[PDB]
Amino acid sequence: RLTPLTVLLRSVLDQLQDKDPARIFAQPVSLKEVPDYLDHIKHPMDFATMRKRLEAQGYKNLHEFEEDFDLIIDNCMKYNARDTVFYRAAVRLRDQGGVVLRQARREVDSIGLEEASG
Ligand SMILES: COc1cc2c(cc1NS(=O)(=O)c1ccc(Br)cc1C)n(C)c(=O)n2C
Numbered sequence: 146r147l148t149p150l151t152v153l154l155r156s157v158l159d160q161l162q163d164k165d166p167a168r169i170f171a172q173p174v175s176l177k178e179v180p181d182y183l184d185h186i187k188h189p190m191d192f193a194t195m196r197k198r199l200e201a202q203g204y205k206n207l208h209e210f211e212e213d214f215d216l217i218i219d220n221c222m223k224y225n226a227r228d229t230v231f232y233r234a235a236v237r238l239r240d241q242g243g244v245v246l247r248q249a250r251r252e253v254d255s256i257g258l259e260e261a262s263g
């Protein structure tokens with residue numbers, strides 16, 4: 146059943162998806178369209194995959210969730226050249242999503258997980 150952590154992470158994940166209006170990070174990179182993607186990228190990640198893990202209650206804490214978000218960003222910045230729509234979108238999401246994640250971390254530290262999740 147339902148931990149304050151899952152309640153918090155549901156909110157945080159939707160706030161992160163709210164920073165991706167193009168849906169660039171919403172679903173896995175297609176290996177059919179980009180057949181060399183995994184040559185380069187060991188741990189693919191995207192928001193749908195994070196949601197599945199979240200709903201399976203597979204995150205121990207906020208840090209583990211943040212690490213998956215960081216994979217999304219870091220994979221994109223590794224795979225794509227700097228002068229691309231993908232790289233620019235990853236930088237913007239790193240910036241805007243970072244604000245969201247830092248706020249969540251500080252709220253948990255300030256008022257506790259139970260209160261922060263509510
Ligand atoms: C969600 O679709 C993709 C996301 C990414 C991605 C590739 C795709 N999928 S895709 O089939 O190549 C694609 C490319 C351009 C458009 Br417009 C739409 C899709 C689905 N790459 C190389 C990334 O770094 N990202 C984040």
Ligand code: NI
Nearest residue numbers: 186187188189
């Ligand atoms: Ni490793």
